[PDB]
Every structure is written in C-alpha cells, then in structure tokens.
Design a protein around this ligand. Structure first.
Ligand SMILES: CC(C)n1cc(C(=O)c2cncc(NC(=O)Cc3ccc(C#N)cc3)c2)c2cncnc21
Length: 277
C-alpha cells in the first residue's frame, strides 16, 4: 500500500486523541474503507474548547490494515503545508479505529467547481480559477520537495475551506488523469504528478468536467497511450493552456517543473490576464 513511500521516515509519533474527546455528528461521505463523519473534537487545540473536525472510521480489524493504518497515520503527520490536508491524529481506543482531519466547510473541489459554474454563490471568475490552480500547484511544490508522489491528483481529492482556501488530500485506477508511462508501466513519479496537475488545470477551467468525457474508459486509455491531447477549455486563457501543454509533454523529463508551473500560476493569479471567452 505505502511501499512507494519507503524512503519517507517519520521524526515522531502520531498524535493520539481520546475516544471520549470525539463526538460524531453526521456522515459527510464514505467510499475508501470507508465512512467520513463531521464531528466535534474537544481538547485538541488550546484556543477552542470544542471544534469541528472530519473523522474517518477504519472498516477492517484486520490485522494487515492495522499496519497500513499506522504507516498511513505516520506519513500524514509529516505532511505540514498550507495547501495539503491537515491531519490531527488517531483514536486507537476501542473499535473502529479513527483518523481525524481538519473540517473543510465547502467540501470537495470537484463539487465546488460544478456548483459555482457559469461562500459567495455564483460563477467563479478568472481570478478565482487562477487562485484555486495556484494553491493546488503550491501544495504540489511542497510534495515534490519532500520526494512524495501523490499518484491520484484530481479535483475530487482537494478540499475547499473558509475563504476559498484549497488543500490537497486523497479520499480514495484514475486512468483519465494518468500519463502513458503510468498507465502502461505503473511508473509514478514527480513527473507523472505534474501531468495529472495539467489535467487538474483542465478540470478547473471546465468547472469540473470529467477529462475525456466524450470517451469510454477503454477509448480514453487508448487515446492517452497513443498521444492525444485534451482540448483547450472555453474559459482557459492561452497562458494557462501553455501550462497544460508543458505538463503534458510525452517525455517525462521534458515536462515543465512544478516550481515553474506554480510560479507561472502565481504570476497570472496576481494579475489576472485580460481574458474573455
Ligand atoms: C470529501 C469529504 C467527505 N471530506 C473528506 C475529508 C478529509 O479530510 C479526509 C477524509 N478521508 C480521508 C482523508 N485522507 C487524506 O486526505 C489522506 C491524504 C493523502 C495525501 C495527502 C497529500 N498530499 C494528504 C492527505 C481525508 C473532509 C474534510 N472536511 C470536509 N469534507 C471532507
């Protein structure tokens, strides 16, 4: 499960939260092994007696998944950045085992883009789309610096919090977001993550449309492996499409670096370019 992260070694133990300090409210979702709940957490942060958090409950007993649980928690406690999901700790007293994360009030970024298409309710403007893209790219610069390969960067795996703050997580193959070498050879690197970031840019600029939406799963695999490129979205300025093309170079060593992609998006976000569809 975490074999590709073997080079990442924790400095310290995970934060432990007493079960009685967690008060479950309602389900936010499920999926990947499995249930996510909104909850109140007591005695976590000094500033607030009680605070909202998101709690993931482990389904398995197992005891293989217990080893995976501990390793996952150890890796998540290392990820400390403004644009990476914030992990608060575990609860190991009793069953099921719990993982506690920061509550991000606006939910996943894919749903957010779809519900704010053509909080402040309404369509997201160019400056806002660039700000979302810049934040994801900032998170990816941090991951590249840690030599951490995400492997499933997609808007469904990002969260939106207070003031449109965006953070990268992984809520649980995402073939449509993968480069040819990942599909064909399961080669996952900083370079395959940058290709997926180019696909995330495409999702942002299409307001959360599915990549290769016109194709079946089989047609998409073949088209990616044969070298076809996603079309420039209507809301996408030329400056932004050039970034996508840089992320999508067939040769991984030719792809633009995430530091340059982030710096370019910062430059555009702090402007933005005078672009009208
Ligand atoms: C969508 C919705 C139901 N939802 C889920 C929320 C979660 O916080 C969450 C739930 N389950 C598992 C995780 N695990 C991870 O993200 C692991 C991880 C992997 C890679 C990186 C990197 N780089 C960082 C972390 C987090 C969440 C919070 N607030 C509101 N809705 C939320």
């Amino acid at each position: 499960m975490h074999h590709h992260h073997h080079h990442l070694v924790p400095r310290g133990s995970v934060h432990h939260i007493k079960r009685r300090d967690i008060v479950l409210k309602w389900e936010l979702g499920e999926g990947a092994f499995g249930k996510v709940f909104l909850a109140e957490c007591h005695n976590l942060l000094p500033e607030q007696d009680k605070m909202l958090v998101a709690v993931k409950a482990l389904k398995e007993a197992s005891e293989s998944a217990r080893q995976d649980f501990q390793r996952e928690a150890e890796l998540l406690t290392m990820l400390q950045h403004q644009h990476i999901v914030r992990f608060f700790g575990v609860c190991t007293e009793g069953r099921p085992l719990l993982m506690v994360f920061e509550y991000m009030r606006h939910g996943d970024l894919n749903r957010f883009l779809r519900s704010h298409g053509p909080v402040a309710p309404g369509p997201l403007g160019l400056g806002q789309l660039l700000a979302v893209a810049s934040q994801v790219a900032a998170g990816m610069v941090y991951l590249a610096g840690l030599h951490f390969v995400h492997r499933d960067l997609a808007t469904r795996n990002c969260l939106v919090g207070q003031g449109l703050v965006v953070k990268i997580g992984d809520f649980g193959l995402p073939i449509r977001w993968m480069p040819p070498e990942s599909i064909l050879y399961r080669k996952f690197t900083t370079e395959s993550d940058v290709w997926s970031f180019g696909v995330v840019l495409w999702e942002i600029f299409t307001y959360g449309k599915q990549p290769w939406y016109q194709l079946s799963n089989t047609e998409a695999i073949d088209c990616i492996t044969q070298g076809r490129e996603l079309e420039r979205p209507r809301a996408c300025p030329p400056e932004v499409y050039a970034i996508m093309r840089g992320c999508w170079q067939r040769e991984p060593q030719q792809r633009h670096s995430i530091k340059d992609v982030h710096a370019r998006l910062q430059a555009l976000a702090q402007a933005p370019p005078v672009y009208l569809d």
